[PDB]
mmCIF file of C-alpha atoms and ligand atoms in Angstrom:
data_model
loop_
_atom_site.group_PDB
_atom_site.id
_atom_site.type_symbol
_atom_site.label_atom_id
_atom_site.label_comp_id
_atom_site.label_asym_id
_atom_site.label_seq_id
_atom_site.Cartn_x
_atom_site.Cartn_y
_atom_site.Cartn_z
ATOM 1 C CA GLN A 1 -14.890 9.483 -18.090
ATOM 2 C CA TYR A 2 -13.487 6.964 -15.353
ATOM 3 C CA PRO A 3 -13.909 8.055 -11.707
ATOM 4 C CA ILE A 4 -10.858 9.716 -10.177
ATOM 5 C CA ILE A 5 -9.702 9.277 -6.250
ATOM 6 C CA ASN A 6 -7.121 11.471 -5.059
ATOM 7 C CA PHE A 7 -4.450 10.724 -2.333
ATOM 8 C CA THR A 8 -1.443 12.781 -1.357
ATOM 9 C CA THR A 9 1.269 11.223 1.039
ATOM 10 C CA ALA A 10 2.122 15.022 1.935
ATOM 11 C CA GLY A 11 1.039 15.554 5.382
ATOM 12 C CA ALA A 12 -0.931 12.058 5.125
ATOM 13 C CA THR A 13 -2.697 10.857 8.523
ATOM 14 C CA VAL A 14 -4.423 7.701 9.574
ATOM 15 C CA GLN A 15 -7.765 9.668 8.809
ATOM 16 C CA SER A 16 -6.815 10.856 5.316
ATOM 17 C CA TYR A 17 -5.475 7.325 4.351
ATOM 18 C CA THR A 18 -8.706 5.902 5.800
ATOM 19 C CA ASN A 19 -10.633 8.214 3.625
ATOM 20 C CA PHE A 20 -9.019 7.332 0.380
ATOM 21 C CA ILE A 21 -9.066 3.593 0.891
ATOM 22 C CA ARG A 22 -12.869 3.813 1.755
ATOM 23 C CA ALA A 23 -13.300 5.787 -1.345
ATOM 24 C CA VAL A 24 -11.463 3.319 -3.372
ATOM 25 C CA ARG A 25 -13.607 0.435 -1.914
ATOM 26 C CA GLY A 26 -16.690 2.643 -2.763
ATOM 27 C CA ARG A 27 -15.563 3.086 -6.715
ATOM 28 C CA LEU A 28 -14.504 -0.725 -6.970
ATOM 29 C CA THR A 29 -17.697 -2.303 -5.526
ATOM 30 C CA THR A 30 -21.319 -1.319 -6.820
ATOM 31 C CA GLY A 31 -23.344 -3.003 -3.753
ATOM 32 C CA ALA A 32 -24.738 -5.292 -6.044
ATOM 33 C CA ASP A 33 -22.852 -8.363 -4.558
ATOM 34 C CA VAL A 34 -22.542 -8.865 -0.988
ATOM 35 C CA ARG A 35 -21.869 -12.573 0.325
ATOM 36 C CA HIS A 36 -21.562 -13.386 4.146
ATOM 37 C CA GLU A 37 -21.130 -9.622 4.885
ATOM 38 C CA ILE A 38 -18.111 -9.464 2.329
ATOM 39 C CA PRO A 39 -18.417 -7.479 -1.074
ATOM 40 C CA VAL A 40 -17.556 -9.071 -4.218
ATOM 41 C CA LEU A 41 -16.338 -7.018 -7.083
ATOM 42 C CA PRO A 42 -18.072 -6.660 -10.411
ATOM 43 C CA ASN A 43 -18.079 -9.807 -12.638
ATOM 44 C CA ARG A 44 -15.814 -9.236 -15.634
ATOM 45 C CA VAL A 45 -18.412 -11.351 -17.828
ATOM 46 C CA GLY A 46 -20.562 -8.692 -19.633
ATOM 47 C CA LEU A 47 -19.180 -5.621 -17.713
ATOM 48 C CA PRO A 48 -19.306 -2.569 -20.146
ATOM 49 C CA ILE A 49 -15.955 -1.077 -20.938
ATOM 50 C CA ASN A 50 -17.271 2.436 -19.448
ATOM 51 C CA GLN A 51 -17.167 0.801 -16.117
ATOM 52 C CA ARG A 52 -14.199 -1.028 -16.247
ATOM 53 C CA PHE A 53 -11.564 1.316 -14.581
ATOM 54 C CA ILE A 54 -11.079 3.661 -11.583
ATOM 55 C CA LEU A 55 -8.239 6.353 -11.726
ATOM 56 C CA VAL A 56 -6.016 6.875 -8.457
ATOM 57 C CA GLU A 57 -4.371 10.170 -8.802
ATOM 58 C CA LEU A 58 -1.265 10.030 -6.057
ATOM 59 C CA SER A 59 0.376 13.118 -5.189
ATOM 60 C CA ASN A 60 3.444 13.810 -2.920
ATOM 61 C CA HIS A 61 5.449 16.391 -1.023
ATOM 62 C CA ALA A 62 7.666 16.872 -3.811
ATOM 63 C CA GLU A 63 4.667 18.388 -5.897
ATOM 64 C CA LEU A 64 4.616 15.613 -8.293
ATOM 65 C CA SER A 65 1.655 13.409 -9.551
ATOM 66 C CA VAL A 66 0.934 10.113 -11.010
ATOM 67 C CA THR A 67 -2.205 8.491 -11.817
ATOM 68 C CA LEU A 68 -2.641 4.744 -11.342
ATOM 69 C CA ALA A 69 -5.248 2.798 -13.269
ATOM 70 C CA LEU A 70 -7.071 -0.014 -11.714
ATOM 71 C CA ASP A 71 -9.224 -2.736 -13.182
ATOM 72 C CA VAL A 72 -12.578 -2.557 -10.840
ATOM 73 C CA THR A 73 -12.831 -6.511 -11.510
ATOM 74 C CA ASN A 74 -9.895 -7.260 -9.343
ATOM 75 C CA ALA A 75 -8.669 -4.008 -8.168
ATOM 76 C CA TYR A 76 -5.544 -4.904 -10.439
ATOM 77 C CA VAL A 77 -2.967 -1.972 -11.173
ATOM 78 C CA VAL A 78 -2.648 -2.211 -14.959
ATOM 79 C CA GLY A 79 -0.588 0.947 -15.494
ATOM 80 C CA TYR A 80 0.154 4.664 -14.953
ATOM 81 C CA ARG A 81 0.349 8.051 -16.133
ATOM 82 C CA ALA A 82 2.974 10.697 -15.314
ATOM 83 C CA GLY A 83 2.633 13.731 -17.455
ATOM 84 C CA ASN A 84 3.037 13.277 -21.185
ATOM 85 C CA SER A 85 3.708 9.563 -20.790
ATOM 86 C CA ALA A 86 1.634 6.399 -19.746
ATOM 87 C CA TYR A 87 2.922 2.960 -19.062
ATOM 88 C CA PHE A 88 1.034 -0.316 -18.857
ATOM 89 C CA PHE A 89 2.074 -3.771 -17.802
ATOM 90 C CA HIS A 90 2.228 -6.601 -20.319
ATOM 91 C CA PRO A 91 -1.634 -7.727 -20.420
ATOM 92 C CA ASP A 92 -2.352 -11.306 -19.484
ATOM 93 C CA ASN A 93 -5.020 -11.615 -22.138
ATOM 94 C CA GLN A 94 -6.664 -10.136 -25.133
ATOM 95 C CA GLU A 95 -9.526 -8.646 -23.404
ATOM 96 C CA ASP A 96 -7.094 -6.956 -20.944
ATOM 97 C CA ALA A 97 -5.035 -5.591 -23.889
ATOM 98 C CA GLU A 98 -8.179 -4.171 -25.657
ATOM 99 C CA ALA A 99 -9.334 -2.756 -22.118
ATOM 100 C CA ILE A 100 -6.264 -0.757 -21.800
ATOM 101 C CA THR A 101 -6.553 1.074 -25.091
ATOM 102 C CA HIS A 102 -9.594 2.902 -23.188
ATOM 103 C CA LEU A 103 -7.116 4.416 -20.627
ATOM 104 C CA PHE A 104 -5.126 7.714 -20.943
ATOM 105 C CA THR A 105 -6.253 8.248 -24.526
ATOM 106 C CA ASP A 106 -5.057 11.842 -24.738
ATOM 107 C CA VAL A 107 -1.748 11.135 -23.761
ATOM 108 C CA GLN A 108 1.047 11.936 -25.977
ATOM 109 C CA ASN A 109 3.269 8.824 -25.315
ATOM 110 C CA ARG A 110 1.868 5.393 -24.786
ATOM 111 C CA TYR A 111 4.084 2.589 -23.614
ATOM 112 C CA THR A 112 3.397 -1.086 -22.966
ATOM 113 C CA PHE A 113 5.998 -3.026 -20.925
ATOM 114 C CA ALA A 114 7.541 -6.169 -21.993
ATOM 115 C CA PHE A 115 6.889 -7.744 -18.710
ATOM 116 C CA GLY A 116 3.474 -8.477 -16.747
ATOM 117 C CA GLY A 117 2.929 -6.924 -13.483
ATOM 118 C CA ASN A 118 2.328 -9.626 -11.235
ATOM 119 C CA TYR A 119 4.383 -9.735 -7.913
ATOM 120 C CA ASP A 120 6.656 -12.604 -9.140
ATOM 121 C CA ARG A 121 7.981 -10.576 -12.257
ATOM 122 C CA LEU A 122 8.074 -7.292 -10.319
ATOM 123 C CA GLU A 123 10.322 -9.061 -7.612
ATOM 124 C CA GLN A 124 12.660 -10.374 -10.089
ATOM 125 C CA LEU A 125 13.219 -7.023 -11.727
ATOM 126 C CA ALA A 126 13.374 -5.313 -8.197
ATOM 127 C CA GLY A 127 16.093 -7.646 -7.103
ATOM 128 C CA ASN A 128 13.910 -7.981 -3.792
ATOM 129 C CA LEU A 129 10.953 -9.827 -2.422
ATOM 130 C CA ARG A 130 7.968 -8.127 -0.995
ATOM 131 C CA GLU A 131 9.363 -9.706 2.637
ATOM 132 C CA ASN A 132 12.434 -7.278 2.132
ATOM 133 C CA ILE A 133 10.627 -3.776 0.471
ATOM 134 C CA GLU A 134 9.989 -1.397 3.246
ATOM 135 C CA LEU A 135 6.111 0.130 3.305
ATOM 136 C CA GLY A 136 4.658 3.225 4.651
ATOM 137 C CA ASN A 137 4.126 7.039 3.960
ATOM 138 C CA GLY A 138 7.883 7.383 3.186
ATOM 139 C CA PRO A 139 8.282 4.562 0.662
ATOM 140 C CA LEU A 140 5.040 5.802 -1.002
ATOM 141 C CA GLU A 141 6.289 9.174 -1.129
ATOM 142 C CA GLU A 142 9.417 7.980 -2.861
ATOM 143 C CA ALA A 143 7.620 5.774 -5.071
ATOM 144 C CA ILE A 144 5.555 8.537 -6.523
ATOM 145 C CA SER A 145 8.665 10.476 -7.447
ATOM 146 C CA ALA A 146 10.331 7.239 -8.818
ATOM 147 C CA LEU A 147 7.255 6.568 -11.160
ATOM 148 C CA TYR A 148 7.103 10.353 -11.834
ATOM 149 C CA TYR A 149 10.762 10.529 -13.172
ATOM 150 C CA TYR A 150 11.016 7.207 -15.001
ATOM 151 C CA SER A 151 10.329 8.563 -18.525
ATOM 152 C CA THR A 152 13.374 10.761 -18.331
ATOM 153 C CA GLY A 153 15.677 8.033 -17.269
ATOM 154 C CA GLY A 154 16.125 9.298 -13.646
ATOM 155 C CA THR A 155 14.702 5.896 -12.257
ATOM 156 C CA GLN A 156 16.336 2.445 -13.008
ATOM 157 C CA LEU A 157 14.381 -0.350 -13.724
ATOM 158 C CA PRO A 158 14.549 -2.199 -10.320
ATOM 159 C CA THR A 159 13.736 0.966 -8.538
ATOM 160 C CA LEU A 160 10.440 1.335 -10.700
ATOM 161 C CA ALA A 161 9.678 -2.265 -9.810
ATOM 162 C CA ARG A 162 10.032 -1.794 -6.266
ATOM 163 C CA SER A 163 7.834 1.399 -6.474
ATOM 164 C CA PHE A 164 4.985 -0.410 -8.244
ATOM 165 C CA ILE A 165 5.220 -3.306 -5.451
ATOM 166 C CA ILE A 166 4.882 -0.324 -2.754
ATOM 167 C CA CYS A 167 1.906 1.089 -4.644
ATOM 168 C CA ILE A 168 0.192 -2.025 -5.139
ATOM 169 C CA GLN A 169 0.399 -3.124 -1.585
ATOM 170 C CA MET A 170 -0.664 0.207 -0.042
ATOM 171 C CA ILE A 171 -3.591 0.789 -2.467
ATOM 172 C CA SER A 172 -4.997 -2.584 -3.937
ATOM 173 C CA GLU A 173 -3.875 -5.114 -1.184
ATOM 174 C CA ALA A 174 -5.380 -2.275 1.406
ATOM 175 C CA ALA A 175 -8.588 -2.044 -0.541
ATOM 176 C CA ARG A 176 -8.999 -5.859 -0.599
ATOM 177 C CA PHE A 177 -8.196 -6.257 3.140
ATOM 178 C CA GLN A 178 -9.144 -4.319 6.088
ATOM 179 C CA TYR A 179 -6.205 -6.150 7.723
ATOM 180 C CA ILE A 180 -3.618 -4.696 5.311
ATOM 181 C CA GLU A 181 -5.372 -1.233 5.507
ATOM 182 C CA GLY A 182 -4.843 -1.455 9.284
ATOM 183 C CA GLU A 183 -1.154 -2.639 8.879
ATOM 184 C CA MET A 184 -0.836 0.747 6.847
ATOM 185 C CA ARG A 185 -2.467 3.140 9.091
ATOM 186 C CA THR A 186 -0.162 1.724 12.154
ATOM 187 C CA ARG A 187 2.859 2.657 9.773
ATOM 188 C CA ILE A 188 1.318 6.040 9.068
ATOM 189 C CA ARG A 189 0.247 6.750 12.721
ATOM 190 C CA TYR A 190 3.947 6.357 13.746
ATOM 191 C CA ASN A 191 5.666 7.405 10.711
ATOM 192 C CA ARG A 192 7.727 4.096 10.746
ATOM 193 C CA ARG A 193 8.305 2.448 7.509
ATOM 194 C CA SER A 194 8.766 -1.521 7.681
ATOM 195 C CA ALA A 195 8.715 -4.505 5.225
ATOM 196 C CA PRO A 196 5.321 -6.534 5.325
ATOM 197 C CA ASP A 197 5.310 -9.338 8.006
ATOM 198 C CA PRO A 198 4.149 -13.015 7.108
ATOM 199 C CA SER A 199 0.502 -12.370 7.879
ATOM 200 C CA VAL A 200 0.361 -9.759 5.481
ATOM 201 C CA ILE A 201 2.369 -11.565 2.775
ATOM 202 C CA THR A 202 0.205 -14.860 3.242
ATOM 203 C CA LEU A 203 -3.050 -12.672 2.990
ATOM 204 C CA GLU A 204 -1.819 -11.358 -0.194
ATOM 205 C CA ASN A 205 -1.077 -14.465 -1.706
ATOM 206 C CA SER A 206 -4.272 -16.272 -0.643
ATOM 207 C CA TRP A 207 -6.703 -13.484 -1.767
ATOM 208 C CA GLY A 208 -7.993 -15.700 -4.921
ATOM 209 C CA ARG A 209 -8.299 -18.770 -2.725
ATOM 210 C CA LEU A 210 -9.921 -17.097 -0.050
ATOM 211 C CA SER A 211 -12.420 -15.624 -2.602
ATOM 212 C CA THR A 212 -13.215 -19.054 -4.201
ATOM 213 C CA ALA A 213 -13.361 -20.847 -0.864
ATOM 214 C CA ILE A 214 -15.976 -18.091 0.750
ATOM 215 C CA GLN A 215 -18.008 -18.087 -2.455
ATOM 216 C CA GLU A 216 -17.839 -21.892 -2.961
ATOM 217 C CA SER A 217 -18.459 -22.512 0.806
ATOM 218 C CA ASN A 218 -21.492 -24.599 2.325
ATOM 219 C CA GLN A 219 -23.281 -21.835 4.298
ATOM 220 C CA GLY A 220 -19.804 -20.313 4.962
ATOM 221 C CA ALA A 221 -18.128 -23.536 5.923
ATOM 222 C CA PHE A 222 -14.972 -24.388 3.753
ATOM 223 C CA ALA A 223 -14.671 -27.823 2.215
ATOM 224 C CA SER A 224 -10.917 -27.450 2.606
ATOM 225 C CA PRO A 225 -9.220 -25.441 5.089
ATOM 226 C CA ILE A 226 -6.927 -22.595 4.160
ATOM 227 C CA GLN A 227 -3.511 -22.011 5.882
ATOM 228 C CA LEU A 228 -2.423 -18.446 6.960
ATOM 229 C CA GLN A 229 0.360 -17.062 9.051
ATOM 230 C CA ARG A 230 0.502 -14.937 12.070
ATOM 231 C CA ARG A 231 2.879 -11.832 12.518
ATOM 232 C CA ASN A 232 5.513 -14.225 14.185
ATOM 233 C CA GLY A 233 5.217 -16.700 11.027
ATOM 234 C CA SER A 234 3.230 -19.479 12.829
ATOM 235 C CA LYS A 235 0.392 -21.257 10.967
ATOM 236 C CA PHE A 236 -3.498 -21.299 11.730
ATOM 237 C CA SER A 237 -6.189 -22.710 9.845
ATOM 238 C CA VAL A 238 -9.296 -20.802 8.323
ATOM 239 C CA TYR A 239 -12.265 -23.249 8.329
ATOM 240 C CA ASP A 240 -15.111 -20.524 7.870
ATOM 241 C CA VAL A 241 -15.970 -17.186 6.473
ATOM 242 C CA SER A 242 -16.907 -15.830 9.881
ATOM 243 C CA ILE A 243 -13.384 -15.387 10.957
ATOM 244 C CA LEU A 244 -12.352 -13.260 7.854
ATOM 245 C CA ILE A 245 -15.353 -11.003 7.922
ATOM 246 C CA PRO A 246 -12.991 -8.372 9.913
ATOM 247 C CA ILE A 247 -9.820 -9.435 7.637
ATOM 248 C CA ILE A 248 -11.128 -9.416 4.005
ATOM 249 C CA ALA A 249 -12.998 -6.160 2.510
ATOM 250 C CA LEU A 250 -13.717 -7.357 -0.906
ATOM 251 C CA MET A 251 -13.266 -10.478 -3.085
ATOM 252 C CA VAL A 252 -13.094 -11.290 -6.919
ATOM 253 C CA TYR A 253 -15.816 -12.645 -8.721
ATOM 254 C CA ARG A 254 -15.236 -16.537 -8.582
ATOM 255 C CA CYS A 255 -18.851 -18.168 -8.799
ATOM 256 C CA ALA A 256 -22.566 -17.413 -8.793
ATOM 257 C CA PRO A 257 -24.158 -16.960 -5.402
ATOM 258 C CA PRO A 258 -26.124 -20.184 -4.648
ATOM 259 C CA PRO A 259 -29.890 -19.963 -3.929
ATOM 260 C CA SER A 260 -31.308 -19.776 -0.290
ATOM 261 C CA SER A 261 -32.594 -22.660 1.305
ATOM 262 C CA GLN A 262 -36.280 -22.382 2.400
ATOM 263 C CA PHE A 263 -38.441 -24.284 4.859
HETATM 264 N N1 IEZ B 301 0.195 -4.848 -11.113
HETATM 265 C C1 IEZ B 301 -0.483 -5.499 -10.138
HETATM 266 N N2 IEZ B 301 -0.007 -6.897 -9.793
HETATM 267 C C2 IEZ B 301 -0.452 -7.442 -8.731
HETATM 268 N N3 IEZ B 301 0.012 -8.805 -8.441
HETATM 269 C C3 IEZ B 301 -0.438 -9.575 -7.561
HETATM 270 C C4 IEZ B 301 0.050 -10.639 -7.406
HETATM 271 O O1 IEZ B 301 1.211 -11.104 -7.730
HETATM 272 N N4 IEZ B 301 -0.691 -11.793 -6.535
HETATM 273 C C5 IEZ B 301 -0.096 -13.189 -6.326
HETATM 274 C C6 IEZ B 301 -0.653 -13.853 -5.310
HETATM 275 C C7 IEZ B 301 -0.291 -15.274 -5.249
HETATM 276 C C8 IEZ B 301 0.967 -15.481 -4.703
HETATM 277 C C9 IEZ B 301 1.398 -17.009 -4.657
HETATM 278 C C10 IEZ B 301 0.391 -18.182 -4.816
HETATM 279 F F1 IEZ B 301 0.827 -19.500 -4.728
HETATM 280 C C11 IEZ B 301 -1.009 -17.615 -5.261
HETATM 281 C C12 IEZ B 301 -1.417 -16.398 -5.509
HETATM 282 C C13 IEZ B 301 -0.548 -13.920 -7.746
HETATM 283 O O2 IEZ B 301 -1.542 -13.642 -8.348
HETATM 284 O O3 IEZ B 301 0.444 -14.809 -8.091
HETATM 285 C C14 IEZ B 301 -1.629 -9.032 -6.877
HETATM 286 N N5 IEZ B 301 -2.267 -7.847 -6.948
HETATM 287 C C15 IEZ B 301 -1.571 -6.961 -8.050
HETATM 288 C C16 IEZ B 301 -2.349 -5.955 -8.422
HETATM 289 O O4 IEZ B 301 -3.202 -5.444 -8.050
HETATM 290 N N6 IEZ B 301 -1.486 -5.037 -9.412
HETATM 291 N N1 IEZ B 302 -6.696 -6.167 -15.742
HETATM 292 C C1 IEZ B 302 -5.885 -7.119 -15.731
HETATM 293 N N2 IEZ B 302 -6.007 -8.189 -14.752
HETATM 294 C C2 IEZ B 302 -5.035 -9.102 -14.462
HETATM 295 N N3 IEZ B 302 -5.471 -9.979 -13.385
HETATM 296 C C3 IEZ B 302 -4.517 -10.868 -13.303
HETATM 297 C C4 IEZ B 302 -4.855 -12.040 -12.100
HETATM 298 O O1 IEZ B 302 -4.185 -12.683 -11.546
HETATM 299 N N4 IEZ B 302 -6.301 -12.087 -12.312
HETATM 300 C C5 IEZ B 302 -6.886 -13.439 -11.520
HETATM 301 C C6 IEZ B 302 -7.527 -12.877 -10.228
HETATM 302 C C7 IEZ B 302 -6.549 -12.128 -9.232
HETATM 303 C C8 IEZ B 302 -6.311 -10.943 -9.245
HETATM 304 C C9 IEZ B 302 -5.335 -10.268 -8.267
HETATM 305 C C10 IEZ B 302 -4.997 -11.229 -7.138
HETATM 306 F F1 IEZ B 302 -4.108 -10.776 -6.242
HETATM 307 C C11 IEZ B 302 -5.340 -12.421 -6.949
HETATM 308 C C12 IEZ B 302 -6.299 -13.122 -8.049
HETATM 309 C C13 IEZ B 302 -7.513 -14.379 -12.179
HETATM 310 O O2 IEZ B 302 -7.611 -14.054 -13.523
HETATM 311 O O3 IEZ B 302 -8.160 -15.254 -11.738
HETATM 312 C C14 IEZ B 302 -3.227 -10.970 -13.784
HETATM 313 N N5 IEZ B 302 -2.810 -10.115 -14.657
HETATM 314 C C15 IEZ B 302 -3.859 -8.882 -14.835
HETATM 315 C C16 IEZ B 302 -3.535 -8.183 -15.890
HETATM 316 O O4 IEZ B 302 -2.390 -8.132 -16.542
HETATM 317 N N6 IEZ B 302 -4.323 -7.085 -16.181
#
């Protein structure tokens, strides 16, 4: 039922990763909602369950596969399937709890983790912050294997959490931000793994706020500036949507678009 996008870390190139992220974005957004040239994800309100999720099937050089489930309203990774078992993060609300019952329905073993899937919880379990977790094709290759082997006891909980953190950033954050996609393209081009710098971290942390600021803006102008960081950690202020057009690829729905002013 739900659309499937395939990606493999096996012989991954800049182009194959670019095709993948483009395909993910294409299945996340409908084209119905574009504001200041930036697409908005489907509104959760009144969204039919048959349109709620996309599936991301990740394969690796080790000949293993896992399937991530993403909520189309926010690109949130809600859980995964590896062979005969499926695992879901502790849902944040009753609606999201009902929604996940529609995923991986023919799987033999269904588990819901007792922990939620936000970075804060995952970093706690990993024993490391995002700033110290390396990203790139190698980390993703290893993450796929780690998710695959969880059900058989091969993967410790910290490794599982770290592996989720890798997948979320390389798929969902890359889908959300052209800038983050670019940072991952660079790592793939040179086959060099590295932890995300402050520019990546602050963008991830600010996605909700940026989405709201753009959507609530007066003709693109922010009421309140948003502070982001450069690669070197120095602060710069965002006052307007204009500067974000090359940076943010999609937004979470925050409010209705205002009517146009006419002469
Ligand atoms: N499973 C999963 N988890 C995710 N978690 C995050 C995430 O934790 N974002 C943070 C961003 C943030 C961080 C700090 C703040 F002060 C405000 C926002 C949050 O919402 O608290 C963001 N995205 C995802 C995701 O796509 N899938
Ligand atoms: N399907 C699903 N979605 C979830 N979404 C969030 C979450 O933080 N949602 C935010 C939107 C958001 C989503 C991701 C971000 F990186 C930032 C903001 C909200 O409710 O305003 C948090 N948890 C979940 C979850 O457990 N399942």
